[PDB]
Amino acid sequence: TEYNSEAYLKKLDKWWRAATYLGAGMIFLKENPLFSVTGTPIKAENLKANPIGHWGTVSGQTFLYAHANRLINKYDQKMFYMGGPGHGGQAMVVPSYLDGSYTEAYPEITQDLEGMSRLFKRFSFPGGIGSHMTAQTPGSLHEGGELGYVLSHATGAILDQPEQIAFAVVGDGEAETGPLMTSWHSIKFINPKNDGAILPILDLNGFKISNPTLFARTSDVDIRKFFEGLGYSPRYIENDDIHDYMAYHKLAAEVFDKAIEDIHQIQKDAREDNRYQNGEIPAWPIVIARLPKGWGGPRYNDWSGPKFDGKGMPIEHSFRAHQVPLPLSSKNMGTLPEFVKWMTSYQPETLFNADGSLKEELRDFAPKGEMRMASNPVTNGGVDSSNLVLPDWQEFANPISENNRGKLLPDTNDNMDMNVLSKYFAEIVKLNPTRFRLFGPDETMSNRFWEMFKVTNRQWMQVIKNPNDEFISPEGRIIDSQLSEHQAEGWLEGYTLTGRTGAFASYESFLRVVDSMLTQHFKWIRQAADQKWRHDYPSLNVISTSTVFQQDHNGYTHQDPGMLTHLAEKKSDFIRQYLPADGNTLLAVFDRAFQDRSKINHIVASKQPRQQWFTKEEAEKLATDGIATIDWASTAKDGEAVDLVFASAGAEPTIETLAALHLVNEVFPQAKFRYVNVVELGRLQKKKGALNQERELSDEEFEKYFGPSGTPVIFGFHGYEDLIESIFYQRGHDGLIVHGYREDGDITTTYDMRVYSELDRFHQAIDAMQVLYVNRKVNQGLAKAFIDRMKRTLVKHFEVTRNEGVDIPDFTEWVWSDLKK
């Protein structure tokens, strides 16, 4: 009863207004924050010249934040705040400022007049703090700039964290996005026996930037139908008199009380009785809060513009409240009277002392210590942020040696790199039963994670109908049963930022559905690295498999390897892209990836049976150094001059480049060349701008592999050719002869997909012989006879593939053999 009395709710109301007062003031003022309490009227010099920030969403989110604090203290609940409308950065900064966590992160921002003035001036100021809930914000793991991912992130955050609740505010405009709409299905994968809970609040403030919202103009009856159809239990916070603030507080206290209690009851039944393990979906609460936009701020634009019913255009309860609600500035003080009236309406003299500190009677409202949402270790790298316990990856390595390199192992499944990787992943689940997860979009089986299903199932909460279904269970370390890349990526990001490690595998082309989500995750960890008070994070591991050259049953629309270019443009110090050519290298790169911190790890991996090349010693070197000269594939020994260099990155390119130099060496053993296998592609760059040099090769190391400028380089690449061309310009190295994907392909045979882009051995061999002849390193008779033979083979390729639907033995039957000399 003590957390439900009107005396207590009036204290909450004051704390609420205290937070909203500061959030509003820092939009316009850079000093003199308590002008009406300290008896110092506003002067032009106190005002910002170009006020920046958002107002509309703020007061509604601080209302919800205040009520979240009440729940924490009343129920002793571990909880954290996630702001869907992240553009209202004040809704997280000042609540942290009021409970002392902000000062703990920023000692100079003290809880007095000096520190308050310092905070006002830093807000949305050059070199200060942003307007959004960036990593500068204590308690944030979600910036909310690019809208739509707050619920998928919240789900990943509460997976395997049974004691945590995610207090997730969803903007009603945000609710119109694709990712947000489908993220409501997340409760079909949350098992209350082992996982925490998300408490979603739909912030139905009625408007977005310039429009009303589709859900706000949906009736409460239809809103109920929508959420009940998805398995939720909707409860409503609304009132006919929007300024009877105490009426909202009483109702919010009732609704939120039953929301937590129903969540706890759901968790009790699942953990003590074993409920919800038979296909029953818990009736998870969802709170629909109709809190008018710009709540408690300017009501009408009376100072300019047209009139309606003797008043200016409405600001409160309209889109016009979204950003800066007044034209006030140091250059335009016309609306200063309106600002003073607005700011004093909060009664700041009842909220703050003259010395800037919060009134004594309000200091016990917020939680203390780690119970504060801004201090919850979930929001600062996770309660436990340690890396995985890894087994020795060599226990799952292929037995490659000098005598079977470049050949197919007897068990076809061992020639499938993804399947070999699943062996390693399967053991990791055994060693990390609660802190490792695999995510996919209905592709884990198609991507050949076959060993994973020997140790776990896909987590699936709805009814199960074996044998029509397979490898699904209410408890599972894999989450794969929703067809949405946004979901898989959002879950992984939330899981990763909260201290755990996982992997998200997808068809290569369709991982680009999530191009912008990866951008945002890079942005976050890059900014988080600049915060000395923040712990680092585990790395985000995304796998591009079923790649351009391995989409047999799916044609041209499943071919886009451009993710390599997209991520190569970010700061390299936070990006690690790996193109292992075989299973042993793939195992070795993930041993490294799983130990790296605050990275995005992008691995391009093969799933179809392919020749295996490198010993587990060679694989270790390739994964550690990321690049290497392969002596058994080279005719030029250490420190020798070369006529050209062969290099490749990727499984298919490596097979074809190795085959090309073999074909050349068969007729011309005198040609001197090195073969260089490229795994860590970022090592080759030399970009302008800082935070790109951590792994870039020195000029000496680069020349050791590719020789001096002018050295021809036959470079087989998995992705688009522009990325390699930019690299060799950055390195000032003329002579690159790139062979990558050229946006050509369709339904065809395995090796014709390589001929489509002229990546194949025969087109590469021609270019190699042509440059040798052009450089007068070989006589014309031999050059012409060889090139004619390569051309004859390609003619046969086109006849057999179009007439028979199979590849020629020149491709299919080839195995590696020692070079001549």
Ligand X SMILES: Cc1ncc(C[n+]2csc(CCOP(=O)(O)OP(=O)(O)O)c2C)c(N)n1
Nearest to 407 by CA among 547, 589, 609, 630: 609
The residue (of 171 and 494) whose beta carbon lies closer to Mg ion is: 171
What is the smallest separation between the CB atom of 449 and its own copies, expressed in angstroms? 11
Partner whose footprint covers residue 324, from its own copies, ligand X, Mg ion, none (CB < 5 to 8 Å by kind): its own copies
Q: Is residue 205 at the binding interface for Mg ion, with CB under 5 A as the rule? A: yes
Q: Please, which residue, 440 or 499, has the CB nearer to its own copies?
A: 440
Give me the helices (H) in 561-650, please: 563-568, 583-593, 616-625
CB 768 within 8 A of CB 661: yes
Q: How far is the CB of 137 from ligand X (least distance, A)?
A: 16
Q: Determine, following the binding rule CB under 6 A, whether residue 322 of this chain makes contact with ligand X.
A: yes
Does residue 104 bind ligand X (CB under 6 A)? Answer: no
Nearer to ligand X (CB atom), residue 145 or residue 735: 145
User: Between residues 513 and 630, which has the closer beta carbon with respect to ligand X?
Assistant: 513
Among Mg ion, its own copies, ligand X, none, residue 568 binds (CB under 5-8 Å by kind): its own copies
Cα–Cα dist 26/13, whole Å: 20
CB of 284 to ligand X, least distance (A): 21
Q: Which of residues 697-756 bind ligand X (CB under 6 A)?
A: none
Q: How far is the CB of 506 from ligand X (least distance, A)?
A: 7
33 part of the interface to Mg ion, by CB under 5 A: no
In angstroms, the CA 368 to CA 414 distance is 55
- Chain positions 258 to 297 lying near ligand X, rule: CB under 6 A, are 293
Over the window 167 to 206, marking each residue x when it contacts ligand X by CB under 6 A and - when it does not, the resulting string is ----xxxx--x-------------------------x-x-
The CB-of-205 to Mg ion minimum distance in angstroms stands at: 4
Tell me which residue has its CB nearest to ligand X: 171
329 binding Mg ion? (CB under 5 A): no
For residue 736, the partner it binds in ligand X, Mg ion, its own copies, none, with Cβ less than 5 to 8 A by kind, is its own copies
| Phi, psi angles (nearest 5°) of residue 223 | -60, -40
SS3 575: strand
557 binding partner (options Mg ion, its own copies, ligand X, none; Cβ < 5 to 8 Å by kind) = its own copies
**28 with 339: CB under 8 angstroms?**
yes
170/567 with CB nearer Mg ion: 170
Residues 166-185 interacting with Mg ion (rule: CB under 5 A): 171-173
Q: Which of residues 612 and 692 has its CB atom nearest to its own copies in the complex?
A: 692
Provide, rounded to whole angstroms, the least separation between the CB of residue 188 and its own copies: 6
CA trace torsion 409, 413, 417, 422 (10° rounding) = -140
**Which listed residue (26, 343, 418, 513) binds ligand X by CB under 6 A?**
513
Q: Which is nearer to Mg ion, 147 or 374 (CB)?
A: 147
Q: How far is CA 469 from CA 458, 460, 473, 481, 503, in A?
A: 11, 11, 10, 11, 24
How many CA atoms within 13 Å lie on the side-chain side of 158? 30
Q: What is the C-alpha R_g of the chain?
A: 31
Looking at beta carbons only, is 174 or 573 nearer to Mg ion? 174
- Would you count residue 146 as binding ligand X (CB under 6 A)? yes
| Main-chain phi, psi angles of 491, to 5 degrees | -60, -50
Distance CA 88, CA 109 (A): 20
Nearest of 216, 201, 244 to residue 318 by alpha carbon? 216
Number of residues that bind ligand X (CB under 6 A): 28
Least separation in angstroms between CB 322 and Mg ion: 8
CA-CA distances (angstroms) from residue 295 to 17, 95, 245, 346, 701?
Answer: 11, 17, 10, 12, 62
Q: Which one of ligand X, its own copies, Mg ion, none is in contact with 128 (Cβ closer than 5 to 8 A by kind)?
A: its own copies
The partner in contact with residue 56, picked from its own copies, ligand X, Mg ion, none with C-beta cut-offs of 5 to 8 angstroms by kind, is: ligand X
Report, in Å, the least distance between residue 88 CB and ligand X.
6
Which CB sits closer to Mg ion, 172 or 451?
172
> Whole-number minimum distance, CB 376 to ligand X, in Å?
23
Q: Which of 35, 184, 207, 460 is in the footprint of ligand X by CB under 6 A? A: 207
494 touches ligand X (CB under 6 A)? no
Answer yes or no: are the C-beta atoms of 357 and 34 closer than 8 Å.
no
CB of 669 to ligand X, least distance (A): 47
- Please tell me whether residue 510 binds ligand X under the rule CB under 6 A: yes
Find the Cα–Cα–Cα–Cα dihedral 349, 353, 358, 360, rounded to 10°: -100
Piece of 299-307, 393-401, 506-514, 690-698 that binds ligand X (CB under 6 A): 506-514
Site string for ligand X, 224-253 (x = CB under 6 A): ------------------------------
Chosen from ligand X, Mg ion, its own copies, none, partner binding at 49 (C-beta under 5 to 8 Å by type): its own copies
Residues ending a continuous segment of the chain before a break (C–N > 2.5 Å)? none
Rounded CA-CA distance 717/158 in Å is: 40
The tokens of 408 are what?
């197919």
Q: Which entry of ligand X, Mg ion, its own copies, none binds 621, CB below 5 to 8 A by partner kind?
A: none
When asked if residue 214 is in the footprint of ligand X (CB under 6 A), the reply is: no
Residue 462, sorted as left (phi over 0), alpha (psi -120 to 50) or beta, turns out to be beta
Output phi, psi for 212, to 5 deg.
-70, 165
Which is nearer to Mg ion, 318 or 541 (by Cβ)? 318
Q: Residue 651 burial (CB < 10 Å; 0-12/13-18/19+)?
A: buried
Q: Which is nearer to ligand X, 174 or 643 (CB)?
A: 174
Q: Where are the alpha helices (DSSP H) in 775-815?
A: 780-804, 809-812
One-letter identity of residue 385: S
Q: Which is nearer to Mg ion, 202 or 768 (CB)?
A: 202
Measured from the CB of residue 142, what is the shortest distance to its own copies in angstroms? 11
Quote the tokens at residue 660: 């090309």
The whole-angstrom separation of Cα 221 and Cα 520 is 36
Whole-angstrom Cα distance, residue 123 to residue 52? 8
Q: CA–CA separation, 64 vs 590, rounded Å? A: 42
Tell me which residues in 437-476 interact with ligand X (CB under 6 A). Answer: 441-442
Question: Cα–Cα distance between 168 and 201 in angstroms, integer?
Answer: 6
Q: Edge-to-edge strand order for the sheet containing 540-545?
A: 472-473, 458-459, 478-479, 436-439, 501-507, 540-545, 600-604, 575-578
The total of other beta-carbon atoms located within 10 Å of residue 376's CB is: 22
**44 or 483, CB closer to ligand X?**
483
State the Cα–Cα distance between residues 218 and 368, nearest whole angstrom.
Answer: 40
* Strand ranges across the sheet with 78-83: 78-83, 164-171, 197-203, 284-289, 232-237
Residues in contact with Mg ion, counted by CB under 5 A, come to a total of: 4
**Which residue, 441 or 580, is less far from ligand X as judged by CB?**
441
Site for ligand X in 40-99 (CB under 6 A): 56-57, 85, 87
Nearest distance in Å: CB 293, ligand X: 5
Q: Which is nearer to its own copies, 86 or 100 (CB)?
A: 86
CB of 211 to Mg ion, least distance (A): 9
3-state secondary structure of 231: coil
Toward Mg ion, which CB reaches closer, 56 or 156?
Answer: 56
Binding site for Mg ion (CB under 5 A): 171-173, 205
Binding site for ligand X (CB under 6 A): 56-57, 85, 87, 145-148, 171-174, 177, 203, 205, 207-209, 213, 293, 322, 441-442, 483, 485, 507, 510, 513
